[PDB]
Design a binder for this molecule. Sequence first.
Ligand code: HEM
Ligand code: HEM
Ligand code: HEM
Ligand code: HEM
Ligand SMILES: [Fe+2]
Ligand SMILES: [Fe+2]
Ligand SMILES: [Fe+2]
Ligand SMILES: [Fe+2]
Ligand SMILES: [Fe+2]
Ligand SMILES: [Fe+2]
Ligand SMILES: [Fe+2]
Ligand SMILES: [Fe+2]
Ligand SMILES: [Fe+2]
Ligand SMILES: [Fe+2]
Ligand SMILES: [Fe+2]
Ligand SMILES: [Fe+2]
Ligand SMILES: [Fe+2]
Ligand SMILES: [Fe+2]
Ligand SMILES: [Fe+2]
Ligand SMILES: [Fe+2]
Ligand SMILES: [Fe+2]
Ligand SMILES: [Fe+2]
Ligand SMILES: [Fe+2]
Ligand SMILES: [Fe+2]
Ligand SMILES: [Fe+2]
Ligand SMILES: [Fe+2]
Ligand SMILES: [Fe+2]
Ligand SMILES: [Fe+2]
Ligand SMILES: [Fe+2]
Ligand SMILES: [Fe+2]
Ligand SMILES: [Fe+2]
Ligand SMILES: [Fe+2]
Ligand SMILES: [Fe+2]
Ligand SMILES: [Fe+2]
Ligand SMILES: [Fe+2]
Ligand SMILES: [Fe+2]
Ligand SMILES: [Fe+2]
Ligand SMILES: [Fe+2]
Ligand SMILES: [Fe+2]
Ligand SMILES: [Fe+2]
Lengths: 155, 156, 155, 156, 156, 155, 156
Amino acid sequence: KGDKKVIQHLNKILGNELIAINQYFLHSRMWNDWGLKRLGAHEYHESIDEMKHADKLIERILFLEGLPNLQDLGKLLIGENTQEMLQCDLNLELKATKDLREAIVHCEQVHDYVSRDLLKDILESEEEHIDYLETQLGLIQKVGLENYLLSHMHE
Amino acid sequence: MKGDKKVIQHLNKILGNELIAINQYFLHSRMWNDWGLKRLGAHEYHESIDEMKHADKLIERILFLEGLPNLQDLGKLLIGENTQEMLQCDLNLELKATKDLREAIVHCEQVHDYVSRDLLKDILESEEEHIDYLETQLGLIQKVGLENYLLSHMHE
Amino acid sequence: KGDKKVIQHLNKILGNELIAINQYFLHSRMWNDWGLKRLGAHEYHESIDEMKHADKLIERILFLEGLPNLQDLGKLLIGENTQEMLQCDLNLELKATKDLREAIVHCEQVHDYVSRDLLKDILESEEEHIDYLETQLGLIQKVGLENYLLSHMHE
Amino acid sequence: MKGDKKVIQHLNKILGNELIAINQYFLHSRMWNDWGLKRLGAHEYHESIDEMKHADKLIERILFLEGLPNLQDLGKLLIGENTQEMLQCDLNLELKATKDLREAIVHCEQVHDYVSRDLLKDILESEEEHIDYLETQLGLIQKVGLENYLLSHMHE
Amino acid sequence: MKGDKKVIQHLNKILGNELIAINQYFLHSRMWNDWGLKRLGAHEYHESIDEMKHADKLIERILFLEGLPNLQDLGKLLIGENTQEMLQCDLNLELKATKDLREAIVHCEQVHDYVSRDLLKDILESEEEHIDYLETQLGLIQKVGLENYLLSHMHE
Amino acid sequence: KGDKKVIQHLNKILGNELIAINQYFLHSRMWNDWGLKRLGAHEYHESIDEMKHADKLIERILFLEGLPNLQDLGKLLIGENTQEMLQCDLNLELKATKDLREAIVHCEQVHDYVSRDLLKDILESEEEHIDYLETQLGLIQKVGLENYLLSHMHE
Amino acid sequence: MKGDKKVIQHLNKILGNELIAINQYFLHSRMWNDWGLKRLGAHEYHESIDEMKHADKLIERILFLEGLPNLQDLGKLLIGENTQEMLQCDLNLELKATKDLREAIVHCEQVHDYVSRDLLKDILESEEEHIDYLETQLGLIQKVGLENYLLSHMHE
Ligand code: HEM
Ligand code: HEM
Ligand code: HEM
Ligand code: HEM
Ligand SMILES: [Fe+2]
Ligand SMILES: [Fe+2]
Ligand SMILES: [Fe+2]
Ligand SMILES: [Fe+2]
Ligand SMILES: [Fe+2]
Ligand SMILES: [Fe+2]
Ligand SMILES: [Fe+2]
Ligand SMILES: [Fe+2]
Ligand SMILES: [Fe+2]
Ligand SMILES: [Fe+2]
Ligand SMILES: [Fe+2]
Ligand SMILES: [Fe+2]
Ligand SMILES: [Fe+2]
Ligand SMILES: [Fe+2]
Ligand SMILES: [Fe+2]
Ligand SMILES: [Fe+2]
Ligand SMILES: [Fe+2]
Ligand SMILES: [Fe+2]
Ligand SMILES: [Fe+2]
Ligand SMILES: [Fe+2]
Ligand SMILES: [Fe+2]
Ligand SMILES: [Fe+2]
Ligand SMILES: [Fe+2]
Ligand SMILES: [Fe+2]
Ligand SMILES: [Fe+2]
Ligand SMILES: [Fe+2]
Ligand SMILES: [Fe+2]
Ligand SMILES: [Fe+2]
Ligand SMILES: [Fe+2]
Ligand SMILES: [Fe+2]
Ligand SMILES: [Fe+2]
Ligand SMILES: [Fe+2]
Ligand SMILES: [Fe+2]
Ligand SMILES: [Fe+2]
Ligand SMILES: [Fe+2]
Ligand SMILES: [Fe+2]
């Protein structure tokens, strides 16, 4: 029933969500293990956000009579310190929004306006995540790494 | 994440229209209150607040895209001298604003800035509600006559 | 009805308020974009204060049968970092209080004691803003810039 | 602490103005209520109460300064015979009242009676609000017409 | 329905007495407060308020009967210079007032204005209660001595 | 910096506040020791009022970049019975209000309208205190001293 | 019941120390508030209030013992120009105060004034808590450094 290429786009977006879920969940637990509990808590909520995006994508693919692909897990970008982990999440988000833009073009082209609207809501949420990440990396420059970690020790 | 230079230019143009509307509607609100047309005064005040919140969202989007919000350049206020002119001045300003919103949305679509498009569409919906109010008021002036129209807008 | 020179004074104070509104609002949003949320929220409230002063001046000019001038916008002093932004706000406030003092003198001279009282209330509010700004700049000297910014990350 | 003789005279002159306004506004209030213009009657009643409170504060200040409050001499009431004259009568009284308040404030400043000045400025602020109200009503009568204006002030 | 001309004159005479009493009691009230005799001051304030309410009722009745309430003519205030004289001044005013009320009630009866009669009787009951208070206070001054009486009225 | 002569006036007003604080507090505790608890409680609250005036003066002097002078303590006028104590407080207030008027004259001359407004608020409170004191002295004459003390035994 | 003359002198000496501490701690509090170190400012304000309560109890005790409290003679305030000196100044003032309290308690014990001794012991306990706070703060400045210490006392 749904357009084969829209479903292929939705499964590509879903694949990015599945990478983001695992990467942000692991970073969260790394920050909690290091005692950087404010970073840990925020990253956990970012993980949950991705989980909810994946759920909406799976439901849409099934409604369109496609097969959701949860088998293919791309590359996790795992950092070894706070600065690399923030940059790894940012790199993942920039790749995610590029794929969202191309999927939205295709939805418009075949007149799947409901799928386009779902993807635009996901895109809004990803750009809020980019905003957060760029702000944090900018704060590290303004106050220095050690001061930055200090302000994120306690929730 | 650096935004398209021409999208930022469009957003600064919309922002410029918002800043005109903030000042024009606020002055109109206070003129009507000074005349004792408090119902008009209060409605116009809330329209001004609406423009203020639009400007806030635009300023925040421009900064996220790493552009410079322009709050320095203030175009021409259309200040009326009586109720009928003030309503028509607001309508002329809204019709220009929606023309500029349509052109900005077109450009956002071309460069795939779908989040900026969505912000502009939300602002555009609100301006069309403002046009609906203004055209409705001008029609009521014709149906009941000016003095009757003012009479019904004396009390809040 | 009201004295023509008093109305010009009131419109000049109004002109200073309109500059302050835009400058503080922009500075607030700049600080929020940088993640300095305590600075951003305080500066937003300063912006809101100027808005209420402007409202009071517009109402008084209309009662005096004058024409409020919301058309002429003087020069915004936008800083590029926290220390310049604070200094730009301080420069703007010191000019605003100079003009308030000259306006109060004239109101006294022509016996417009109600306009004088309105202007004295605004002046009290401006001096509290000056106290805040000079205190912030002194704290930057006492604890250092990076420590100062660290204390204003979270609201 | 005996007050300045000329400050007390000014304070007694202001009090004399309050006493006229009390009686004038109260009678106008009851005239409007008798005519069934209850919104005008109620607003005018509250203006009368406000003048009563001004008189109270002046009387208390005169006694503290060891003067004799004069409640015996009642100047001329300006009683109108219709709504438009009544508003104009109240406005003429308020314009005279504010002229006298301004001269009293000048004199308080000259002899350094800053507390009396501050009392008089609070009264002056309240009288200028009443002038704002009166001029607005007279403006509305021109904009909507007398019969329409009275219509909107029948019910509370 | 226009009221009897002589009844309206009687009502305006009663109104004139109320206006004297309002000002006399208000000034006496503030004099006692200024002297720190706050219980006397507070009781006298409430007497003043009662006269204000009588005046309001009279003004309303005169207007209903299509007369002109006279708030312009203010008779002689009897201001005392100490507590005993102030109480006696109030008592002298109350006795003059009840004589005028009695004469007004007789005329109302003759021309069958029974509603005006009933209003005046209510006012008279209240005036006789004030006479009861004043005579009681003057008697207490005799029984306990002046200094003890004032001591008893320092605090509210 | 604030005007040098305004600051000097403010330190003079402060010096008077510091005398009243101690004088009224001591009188309050004397009346309590004598069992005149109503006088003691009222005098205590007058002492507290002066403490609040002193606080507002200290804060304004610091804002103007002056040095608050809490070191120089002038002459306390301590009475030995109720009538002298009330008269000592009254003499102190009359001296205080004379100095307030001269300070307000100076504020007006140099356009320090906020300092003027603060001093005018202090003067209003001092004239309320003068009202209380003259009223009490008048009551001692009207009812006699022993009757006056009787009425001030209980709170 | 006349107290021992030397006990009263000791109490007036302790009182003299409290009066210095009131003024010094209040000024330091307002200096810290003026610099934006609001946590230091608030804590120092409460230390000032503590000394005010000590002074009150001493004054009451001196009067009960039929002495004359001396609020006239004010010793030397130790005012610092920065946080570390202000803290050291309060600490130097507290060490002098506790030395005088110990000597007063010795004398109270000698003449069997056990109630005055117990009052002085209560004050001494409170002064030793203040010394604990001051020494802890000075120790923290060494452990974390001055800029970090000030940083942690900016916000209440
Ligand atoms: C791969 C590792 C994952 C981990 C470690 C993980 C962990 C969690 C945790 C700890 C919670 C909170 C549960 C609770 O305490 O109530 C949660 C909630 C949730 N998860 Fe996951 N999750 C993972 C993957 C996924 C995936 C792949 C999906 C869907 C495709 C998903 C969907 C959800 C949803 C819908 C919720 C409820 C969110 C809400 O509060 O609305 N999760 N997950
Ligand atoms: C002539 C210039 C302006 C005037 C007279 C004005 C007036 C006001 C007033 C009276 C309020 C109500 C505040 C309160 O009572 O708490 C307000 C709120 C507000 N203003 Fe303005 N304003 C002006 C310009 C601006 C500008 C340029 C902006 C932003 C770009 C702005 C943004 C806001 C916002 C965000 C609020 C809060 C609205 C809400 O309730 O969500 N204003 N303004
Ligand atoms: C024709 C003369 C006057 C009339 C008809 C009048 C009438 C009234 C009335 C109806 C009230 C409300 C009473 C209540 O319901 O409790 C009132 C209140 C009051 N009046 Fe008068 N009054 C007159 C003159 C005065 C004067 C000469 C003074 C003072 C010098 C005065 C002082 C007051 C005060 C202080 C109140 C209470 C106001 C408040 O705080 O609500 N009145 N008057
Ligand atoms: C010398 C300058 C002084 C200043 C600036 C000052 C300031 C203050 C302030 C601001 C308060 C709080 C008042 C309130 O809002 O409740 C206060 C309370 C108090 N003061 Fe003072 N004070 C001073 C001297 C004194 C002295 C010399 C004494 C006693 C001899 C004293 C006794 C008290 C007492 C008993 C309280 C009430 C504390 C409580 O709540 O238990 N003060 N003071
Ligand atoms: Fe996502
Ligand atoms: Fe495609
Ligand atoms: Fe949607
Ligand atoms: Fe994301
Ligand atoms: Fe911890
Ligand atoms: Fe808008
Ligand atoms: Fe374009
Ligand atoms: Fe949206
Ligand atoms: Fe609009
Ligand atoms: Fe409407
Ligand atoms: Fe109205
Ligand atoms: Fe302002
Ligand atoms: Fe001028
Ligand atoms: Fe004011
Ligand atoms: Fe300001
Ligand atoms: Fe801060
Ligand atoms: Fe954070
Ligand atoms: Fe008035
Ligand atoms: Fe004069
Ligand atoms: Fe005031
Ligand atoms: Fe008035
Ligand atoms: Fe009706
Ligand atoms: Fe009566
Ligand atoms: Fe008769
Ligand atoms: Fe009846
Ligand atoms: Fe009576
Ligand atoms: Fe008392
Ligand atoms: Fe004081
Ligand atoms: Fe001077
Ligand atoms: Fe003020
Ligand atoms: Fe005082
Ligand atoms: Fe007792
Ligand atoms: Fe102590
Ligand atoms: Fe000893
Ligand atoms: Fe004990
Ligand atoms: Fe201590």
